[PDB]
Design an enzyme around this catalytic site. Sequence first.
Site, PDB file in Angstrom:
ATOM      1  CG  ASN B  38      -2.992  -1.687  -0.987  1.00 59.39           C
ATOM      2  OD1 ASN B  38      -1.984  -0.999  -1.091  1.00 59.39           O
ATOM      3  ND2 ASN B  38      -4.092  -1.459  -1.691  1.00 59.39           N
ATOM      4  CG  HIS B 124       6.705   2.338  -3.291  1.00 61.57           C
ATOM      5  ND1 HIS B 124       7.304   2.471  -2.055  1.00 61.57           N
ATOM      6  CD2 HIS B 124       5.374   2.479  -3.080  1.00 61.57           C
ATOM      7  CE1 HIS B 124       6.376   2.680  -1.136  1.00 61.57           C
ATOM      8  NE2 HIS B 124       5.196   2.690  -1.732  1.00 61.57           N
ATOM      9  CD  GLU B 166       7.067  -0.428  -7.390  1.00 65.34           C
ATOM     10  OE1 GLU B 166       5.837  -0.465  -7.195  1.00 65.34           O
ATOM     11  OE2 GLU B 166       7.671   0.620  -7.706  1.00 65.34           O
ATOM     12  CB  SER B 170       2.774   1.098  -6.032  1.00 66.72           C
ATOM     13  OG  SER B 170       3.694   2.135  -6.270  1.00 66.72           O
ATOM     14  CG  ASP B 195       8.806  -3.653  -3.538  1.00 62.41           C
ATOM     15  OD1 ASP B 195       8.159  -4.541  -2.916  1.00 62.41           O
ATOM     16  OD2 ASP B 195       8.683  -2.446  -3.245  1.00 62.41           O
ATOM     17  CG  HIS B 198       1.453  -3.523  -4.823  1.00 65.41           C
ATOM     18  ND1 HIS B 198       0.367  -3.094  -4.089  1.00 65.41           N
ATOM     19  CD2 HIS B 198       2.362  -2.517  -4.775  1.00 65.41           C
ATOM     20  CE1 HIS B 198       0.621  -1.892  -3.596  1.00 65.41           C
ATOM     21  NE2 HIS B 198       1.825  -1.521  -3.995  1.00 65.41           N
ATOM     22  CE  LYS B 230       1.324  -2.494  -0.367  1.00 65.66           C
ATOM     23  NZ  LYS B 230       0.424  -1.455   0.223  1.00 65.66           N
TER      24      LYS B 230
END
Lengths: 378, 377
Positions: B38, B124, B166, B170, B195, B198, B230
């Site tokens: 990542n 997550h 998120e 994920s 969150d 990503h 990441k």
Amino acid sequence: AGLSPLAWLADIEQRRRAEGLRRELRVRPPVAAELDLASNDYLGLSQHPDVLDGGVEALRTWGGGAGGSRLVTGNTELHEAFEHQLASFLGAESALVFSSGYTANLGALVALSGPGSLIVSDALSHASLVDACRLSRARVVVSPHRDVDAVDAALAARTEERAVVVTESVFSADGDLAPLRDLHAVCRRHGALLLVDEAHGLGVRGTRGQGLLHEVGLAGAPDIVMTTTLSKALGSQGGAVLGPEAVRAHLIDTARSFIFDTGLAPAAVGAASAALRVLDAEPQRARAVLDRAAELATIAGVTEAPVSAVVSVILGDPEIAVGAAAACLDRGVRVGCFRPPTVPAGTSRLRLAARASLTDDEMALARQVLTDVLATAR
Amino acid sequence: LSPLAWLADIEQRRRAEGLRRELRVRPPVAAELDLASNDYLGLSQHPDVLDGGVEALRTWGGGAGGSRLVTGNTELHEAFEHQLASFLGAESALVFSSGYTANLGALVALSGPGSLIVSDALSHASLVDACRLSRARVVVSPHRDVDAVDAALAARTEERAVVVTESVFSADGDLAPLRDLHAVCRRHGALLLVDEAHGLGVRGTRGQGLLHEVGLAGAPDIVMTTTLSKALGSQGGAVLGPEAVRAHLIDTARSFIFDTGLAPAAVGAASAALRVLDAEPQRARAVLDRAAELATIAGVTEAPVSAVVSVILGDPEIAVGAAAACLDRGVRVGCFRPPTVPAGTSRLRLAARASLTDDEMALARQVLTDVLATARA
């Protein structure tokens, strides 16, 4: 006006300031002006030239981060070479490094206990271990401090097959030593696992700094798992779990704070590998930090020799305790300050953390400052 | 012998079912094209990122030396926090030892007993652990189900409520309905915790995240978490939001106070990466382009909204074989099976990176076409 959902933070700040508990940050410059007796850099290794070299060499070879979870692409040859170096130094069969001591404690205790098991926990346990007990979803019994008999009775009456007894070797609360051999005798009699956090024993206990477990002759037992940090004696960042070869393979397979984290930066692993190299070659450092602590005990009026790096100075009043900490700083000495809820009421204290690299002029400033500040507070 | 002999029985059961994880060892010169990390912007081994880390290490040392509440709070920590909050459009930022401890610290310290957490069903692991730690009443909502969140907030008995999600999930790589969710939080007086691990460096025209992209940056009722490991090629987590949130986490979040605080080398590394992204917003757009390119290769019909492409094989052993056939031909890909992803959805994960070259893509085109056409016969 999305004001309401965060407006309660203001009431918590009023109440925290009302009890005098509101914590704040000070900002430290690169060249520190004041003598530090508050960090847990026990061996002075965070800024040792070899340690600088190890992190930089890792950083240039491997990069700034692991790049992902150790279960995908973050596991370098550097990680496994350090794990071998740490395990060999500590006398353990295997080692596994985590992003921090906090996640190492979560990862180890949760994965070796779990639902349907029993955890016996010391009442003075570090917050990272208390959180782990909550996360394990095990049944949690909290015993009086270092009360081996209480541990015995809890294990003898359990209906759960698997039990883990959790303790610190050197306790972060008071600096006292855990009764490791007695606790271990109770576990084996009851077939329980003994989990030991040596965050404050590593680099401090043992004639060569290898921790209290090694010192009392328990290193490598098939039924003892050890956790430690890389951020105190070893001057870096990270956590580590150590024990039998099966434990490492179990944590890779089930420990949630290992699988779903990105895993320790190379620079931190490189840094800690150099620091362990210096400790192995200069074991007198583990003895100097104990010596400086004793001098700090004498200075502070503590009559019994400290068994660990940090000296507790019971001031007995929160505003007095905070007042003493503030006067030291103004006089060039940064000291540690614990007040309720960290300690019981009426036992507010200063913490004086020894470091192997303290020089004789720095101790005379500690004698000069602490004598004057404490004699006023007394 | 007794207390750890049970681990061997767990190894037998896990290995018999083909789920037993092992750790593989990477050389400094990678042997394979890497499609499983990542490191979305390719910044972990970037020359400036390496420099920023080396300079932070030489000036400050190998570790922070203690918890940031005692002596570990450096001028570098607070300069990166200002640098990051400005980039993100937030009022304040506080960096943690990892994305995992950031998630624990922010959700637990902002919920607590007597509060309500509404959690997305595909959350997550760091988010699942937090709810266990918060001691709040936790309602898990169906994936991206705004109506269920609204109804959960509408019937609650708790005054304080946090809706947690998120931005980029994920599990699947899909996008959260952040604008819809935030209107519901506002209707019911809830906090929105997002969150963005990503989304950072991936969503937004300059990589500033999904919250920024939908115009919600800086809201008084949104708290954001992210990782530095990441896109930003480093180690660490960060929580961002109003100034009172930072002051609260310093005061009460246990995974902040009782951890040692991010190594300078990681902060210097991450500050350098944030500088390169800030100077090269094309790195964010490139990872979505490469992902689209990977999607076309894999036979995935819908354009990816995130860096990682899911390639569903619906069979665990086939997924395992396909990853092995990819690896053996020089390509490392991701391989997920139940219980990690839902039943029936074993898959490969192909993570795009801004630093992928067109020649690496030509090798991915050839190897993936070959492995996948064999695996879907």
